[PDB]
Amino acid sequence: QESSSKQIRIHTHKAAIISHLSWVSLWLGFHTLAVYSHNDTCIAFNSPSKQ
Amino acid sequence: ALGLHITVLILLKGGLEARGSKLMPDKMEHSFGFSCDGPGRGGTCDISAWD
Amino acid sequence: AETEEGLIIKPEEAGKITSRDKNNNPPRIVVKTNDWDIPEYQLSTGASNQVSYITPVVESEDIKAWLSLNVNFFSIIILFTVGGLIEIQRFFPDTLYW
Amino acid sequence: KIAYLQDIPRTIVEKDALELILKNTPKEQWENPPEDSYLYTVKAFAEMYGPGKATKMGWWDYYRLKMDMPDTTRLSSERELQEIEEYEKLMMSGKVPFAVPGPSGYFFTGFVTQWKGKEPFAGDQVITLTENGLFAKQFLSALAFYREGLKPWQRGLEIGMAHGYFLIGPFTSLGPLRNTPEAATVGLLCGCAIVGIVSIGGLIFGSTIKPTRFDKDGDKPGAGFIEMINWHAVGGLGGAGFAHALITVF
Amino acid sequence: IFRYINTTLWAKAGHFNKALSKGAKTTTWIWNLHDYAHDFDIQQRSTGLIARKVFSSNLAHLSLVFFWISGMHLHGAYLSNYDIWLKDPKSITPSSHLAYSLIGQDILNSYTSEYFSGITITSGFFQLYRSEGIITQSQLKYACATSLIATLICLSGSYLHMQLMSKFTSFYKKFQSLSQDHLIIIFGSRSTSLSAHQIHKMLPANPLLDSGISKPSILQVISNSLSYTLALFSTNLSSTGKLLNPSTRSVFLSQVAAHHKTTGVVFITLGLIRFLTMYKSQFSILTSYIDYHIVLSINLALIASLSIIVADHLTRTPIYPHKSTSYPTILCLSIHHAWLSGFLIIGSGAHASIFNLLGSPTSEIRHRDPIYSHLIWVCIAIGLHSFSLYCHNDTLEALGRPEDIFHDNSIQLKAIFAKQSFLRAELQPDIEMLDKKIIRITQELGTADFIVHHIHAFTIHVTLLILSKGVLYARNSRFVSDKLELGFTYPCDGPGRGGTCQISPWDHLFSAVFWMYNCLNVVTFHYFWKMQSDVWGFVSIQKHISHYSQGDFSVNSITINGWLRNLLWSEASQVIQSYALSSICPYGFIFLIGHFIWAFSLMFLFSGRAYWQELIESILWSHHKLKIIPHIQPRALSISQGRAVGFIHYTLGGIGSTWAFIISRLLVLT
Amino acid sequence: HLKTPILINLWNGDIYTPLALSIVQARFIGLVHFSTGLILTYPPFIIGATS
Amino acid sequence: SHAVKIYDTCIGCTLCVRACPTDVLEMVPASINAAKQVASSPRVEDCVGCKRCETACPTDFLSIRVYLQDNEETQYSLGLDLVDWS
Amino acid sequence: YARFNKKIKMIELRETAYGDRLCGKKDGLPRTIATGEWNVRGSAMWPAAIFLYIAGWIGWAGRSYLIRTNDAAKEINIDVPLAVTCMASGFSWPVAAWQEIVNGEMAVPNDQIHNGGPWNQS
């Protein structure tokens, strides 16, 4: 429990770090792939202006 | 940014759980790189920090 | 229940019991098989007009219980959501209002 | 005798079919047929239908019974049972009815090759025709590596002559200079190079593993193998040169 | 009897397996429930229930196939341009498949006829209908009705047999009865029935269409009543297959009807012969192979082999009218059956392994080391030989030494047995053509064909090595001596003995699926390039031929760079430049999606489940922080499931990539 | 190899026993191949496209 | 050879002993649990490393722990069959 | 022909509807505004607000159902009346969630959930 070392303080809440990193990774992947897929689908359908 | 976030996620998770995770709460007794922890306890392929 | 009048008899008295029925159907031999899906197979002793339904036994309660299974619930909701998206796309195409 | 096998009506199962069942079924299972065995159904019905019991059945029940009994053709006859009882005896006795693979299958050659070797638990002593037949044994024993009475240099010389004579061909033909006016001295040089490389490998083997099966008594360990390898190099040179001489002259 | 058919188990998921009775404590329970769904052997109750389940499930699947046939028939009757295709098949692409005008999906329908826009189907159902004398919409209506009736009948039979069959049921074990009745009544007595159907409905009809009367006086002539035409009206002597029908570019249907009649006669005579024929040698096979999994494996291997024979025989033995010119249809009919052959062969290997683990094996497993060792050596020999001739040609062409490569204009490896295999076909010394399109010309086999055939042999042998190694080393091995107790499918035996990952027969199938996929991707590419380069294409009135690939195969397929450039790059221009092009937009999109799925599989293929379990625990921390506790505890996929998901996504993505690549190009070119 | 006529009388495998690569070694070798392929496939494309 | 260690949390299941395929483990009397017995690993030189003992151990975290040592492998720890190292 | 006429009308309607939307001086493809403008054509503020509301609604309904069914049996066999009750009740999530945040009913102290693997002891 001695929260003195920096690695100690990082390890105390390591689950929070990893969970938030997973959240931001999921957000970026979802919203980049989905917008790219929107553009791909709407430009395959002869609609460049629907991107 | 997605790629950087995920690379940092994998590396940071490996660093933080190199000394022990919920699945294998003795990981600092073993080497930095080791095969696995056996098929039991759910299966433990790619469990080391080297993995 | 469904065999309230069958004069059901055991293998040990295959040729001993003869009292037929409230109908004239001869007594039926009940064989206790170990299968859970067919716990008892009934065998006849002669010609008979026995009412053996081929329809299953379902009820509203356990049909609703099956529809309350997480697969059916989360498939009905997602099917309705996808259908609503498709209907919105048909009715308001190209998001002109945006 | 067994109760339910007596006075069984022919309508339940025929006499010949019942005898065939009893023959196919092992004797110990007659009293209490197991389950899912035609004899089990015969017992479960002959104890319900018979002379002193229910003498009639519904048409559908009898129809289903007739499709649970054997149809007199799905049962092995006496000769087939003998075939199995003897094939299994052969297999368990360590002898294999010899068979040879063919076009997706194998033809039985009608031969009993004794399979288990002198050490029955040894995996590599299972004797086969291609390694333990008389011709195979005498051919392997008469090879230069194994021939009795050969000095190590003689084995090396013979093996080297074979290798050097053969190795010229792949280079002098279909080689980089296969169409040049010489086209064979290049092959000779390449074959001699291959012989030298494999001889160097053999020297590495003899200086690292050091086989001692060719050393005479009271000698430096591996000396016989080293002599064999050196004379293999000499024989490879000689065979390569002889093949080249034959190609050029003829 | 049927009073026990109750819905009380519908809500109770996982009832069939006693390992799932503890309840859904973790998410692994869901995947196990889905995995054991059709594993009737390990499910609860006696062996009679296993037979009932197997037979009734077979009937249910048969009903499903009948429903699919009915759907195809209704699409052809009410959602197709089959009318104009009947009137002019050489100018109209088959299409029984439309797309709704939503999200601009209208761009997928393309011009197939002046009155029809839709997706060009390549199933070949229109050619089948024409060969089946189907002309009016009413005929397709009644075909769909009969298929729906068959669906209902088979569904009801599957429902009934779960209670008609009982503990005493034994009709499935009567293998003599099954073989005899199947053989005679189906292969013999139904083949002659189809011969009757053809003689009485095709020859009265298909010659009428070929005679130019697409009118057929409507029903005055088409509706039978044509007993003045004779059965062998236009056989034109010759030999079946030597002379094709000049109008439809196919074998005359009279010859097909005679073939079916004679094959039915042959099957009936074989059924009669089986009363006394050669036996007492396959008898050990007879007694030792009476089990569900062994007969399933045997049937899967047989059906897959028949599928590959169908794939090779549907393309250059033209049976269907107006089908040889329909190049996308020919390509699809070959390649789909090729893929099914590969998949069902792999399934046969898997069920051979399952039979070995459940039943008791045969004599061949005792010298398994020589078998699976000479197989190893032959695989290494033909891999280091077939492929490397490509590597040698590639290296020496890059070095600028074309005279040292393996080509026809260089060191040439003649296909001696194939060049001396003029036995097949044995056609006259020319080609056949219908309308600007080549029907069939003999594939002149050279060096490239030799090398690619050896590549095929090598890939087949390696896939067989994986399958036979899994089968023979299922019970035990020098590595692990109690593999039998470990079951059929297991991740490993542990990191001990150096590492025991993927020793189970299931993992051997897992690798064999990859190797079969790699095996017949080369088959697909060889066919797709060879046909375009050397068979298919336009014509010139001066007897000169202009193929689609302009003869690239014999000059480029000798090097791997040739395959990369002239097949995967130049012939991918149609699919890659397919955006906003009406017919081929979905093919470009599906090409992209197949790439995505194939790359997505690698996440499951390369990673282990422990990392994902730890990540899931890290996320579950945040979930527990906000009082969001999933009581079905989140667990990562099991090792075997991870491998299965990876393999499925890998094969699906790659198959989709090829599928789009070939179909879009053939639709554009045609 | 221990069954081939000449090999068995020279090499019994007791010295440098051939074994399959261990799990960590296998993962590392696959990683090396993947990294080499992915990295070294690019410079040819760069040179072909720019030059 | 690997390293198989038994910790005090053992409750005398005997499941680890039964799961071992090379008779590495054994039951010894003790007084630290209601079963009056704990596991022992007197013959870890025969431990292949399959970790079945760890699969069979029901304590919260395994009372028996197998530590893999790959730079330590002997012929017994590798399960060599075709080749003898003695 | 009629369906293509309808498609042409849709295309012309799209042309006239995107006229007020901003597009680059070199591409011609209309842009989406992500500056929080709230008052431009194609702004991302309105879709963001709508999605955030409905996503919080979904998450709140799921969390409410999980809290009110503290059992694994209720997750495989959904209590449909309670499930739809929570689904309808989720509309007030932006207020109820905040009232739980400030009143100590959403979060849980770290000393009540499994922190993670041990990193030390000796």
Ligand code: CLA
């Ligand atoms: C006649 C064909 C046939 C039959 C009757 C069976 C029957 C059986 N197989 Mg089997 N198998 C077959 C063909 C067949 N197989 C083939 C061709 C292969 C090679 C791939 C296999 C490989 C195989 C393996 C490896 C295993 C079985 C197993 C089993 C048993 C349980 C299956 C189960 O519960 O799965 C439940 C059903 C599923 C999980 C289906 C899920 C869907 C699949 C996995 C993905 C398909 C994706 C789809 C095609 C694409 C989606 C479209 C996309 C656009 C979205 C059962 C006896 C298992 C067993 O334990 O046997 C005793 C087992 O381990 N089989």
Ligand code: CLA
């Ligand atoms: C009750 C449902 C619920 C709720 C409230 C949350 C809430 C949360 N999740 Mg989450 N999650 C859920 C279900 C849920 N999850 C499921 C089913 C999965 C499996 C796919 C995940 C997988 C998941 C991952 C991998 C991650 C989160 C993360 C998070 C946190 C950040 C928000 C986020 O990333 O959302 C985005 C949520 C997703 C991408 C998952 C999909 C959402 C599912 C489909 C909603 C299901 C709701 C359910 C059906 C409601 C039914 C109600 C009815 C029965 C009455 C947040 C605490 C992240 C985190 O820890 O950062 C702090 C993170 O990295 N979740």
Ligand SMILES: CC1=C(/C=C/C(C)=C/C=C/C(C)=C/C=C/C=C(C)/C=C/C=C(C)/C=C/C2=C(C)CCCC2(C)C)C(C)(C)CCC1
């Ligand atoms: C194909 C065939 C086969 C095989 C065969 C073979 C294997 C062969 C081989 C062959 C060979 C492989 C031969 C060789 C020979 C050699 C020789 C003949 C040599 C000689 C040499 C010499 C003579 C030398 C001399 C010398 C020396 C020694 C040194 C010095 C110098 C000189 C030169 C003097 C079989 C049967 C399987 C079957 C079919 C047929």
Ligand code: SF4
């Ligand atoms: S399994 Fe674990 S708890 Fe049980 S006796 Fe063995 S070491 Fe002790």
